[PDB]
Amino acid sequence: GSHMDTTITQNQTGYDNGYFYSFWTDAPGTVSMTLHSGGSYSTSWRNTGHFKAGKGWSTGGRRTVTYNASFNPSGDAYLTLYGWTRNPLVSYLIVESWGTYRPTGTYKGTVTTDGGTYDIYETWRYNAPSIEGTRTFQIFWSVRQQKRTSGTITIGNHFDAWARAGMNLGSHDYQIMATKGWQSSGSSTVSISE
């Protein structure tokens, strides 16, 4: 990378090189994120707990985003467009790739977009870290049926499919192209653009 890159190890949000970024983990010291130029960042993690890290936008919406990634999980991790809404309090994931485990939940249907078919799922997390604290909230999922690590995500197509399936989003908080890890190790480099 560049000597001007910044390596992040503490929970934080902010802006870097034109883009919002978020870094969150319950396992500090097990994961780091390096913020590169433009829409790029890398992560490196080792026997972590839970982390989510990525670049994107502080306010999500129906963006058409293009991303290129190198995604190298050892164990449970996702490469995913990740975001939050409030009222309803929902975390949503458009999962592009995963490691050892393909995330699934309550089947809600399918959506075909950006040359790929995604299964739609809903899950709940109970008493869990959220943008509003320890809460019980919904997760909306679009999980691609086959892994990919570059391409375009027409986010509005996912939002529309979810609405058709009765899954309603609230007011948008942040929206990032994220690396997300659970009790695993690995690395990633992710580059995005709108």
The contact set with Cl ion (CB under 5 A) reads: 8-10
Closest separation in Å from C-beta 11 to Cl ion: 9
CB-nearer residue toward Cl ion: 7 or 145:
7
Query: Does an H or E element contain 152, and which?
Result: strand 150-154
Closest separation in Å from C-beta 101 to Cl ion: 29
CB-nearer residue toward Cl ion: 9 or 117:
9
Closest separation in Å from C-beta 10 to Cl ion: 4
CB-nearer residue toward Cl ion: 8 or 93:
8
Closest separation in Å from C-beta 32 to Cl ion: 8
Closest separation in Å from C-beta 50 to Cl ion: 18
Phi and psi at 158, nearest 5°, equal: -70, -45
CB-nearer residue toward Cl ion: 46 or 102:
46
Query: Does an H or E element contain 160, and which?
Result: helix 155-164
CB-nearer residue toward Cl ion: 10 or 70:
10
DSSP string, 30-81: SEEEEE-STTEEEEEESS-SEEEEEEEESS--S-EEEEEEEEEEESSEEEEE
24/127 Cα distance (integer angstroms): 17
141/65 Cα distance (integer angstroms): 17
- The whole-angstrom distance between residue 91's C-alpha and the CA centroid of its chain comes to 9
Ranked by CB distance to Cl ion, the top (closest) residue is 10
3-state secondary structure at position 163: helix
CB-nearer residue toward Cl ion: 14 or 156:
14
Closest separation in Å from C-beta 25 to Cl ion: 11
Q: Are 137 and 89 in contact (CB under 8 A)?
A: yes
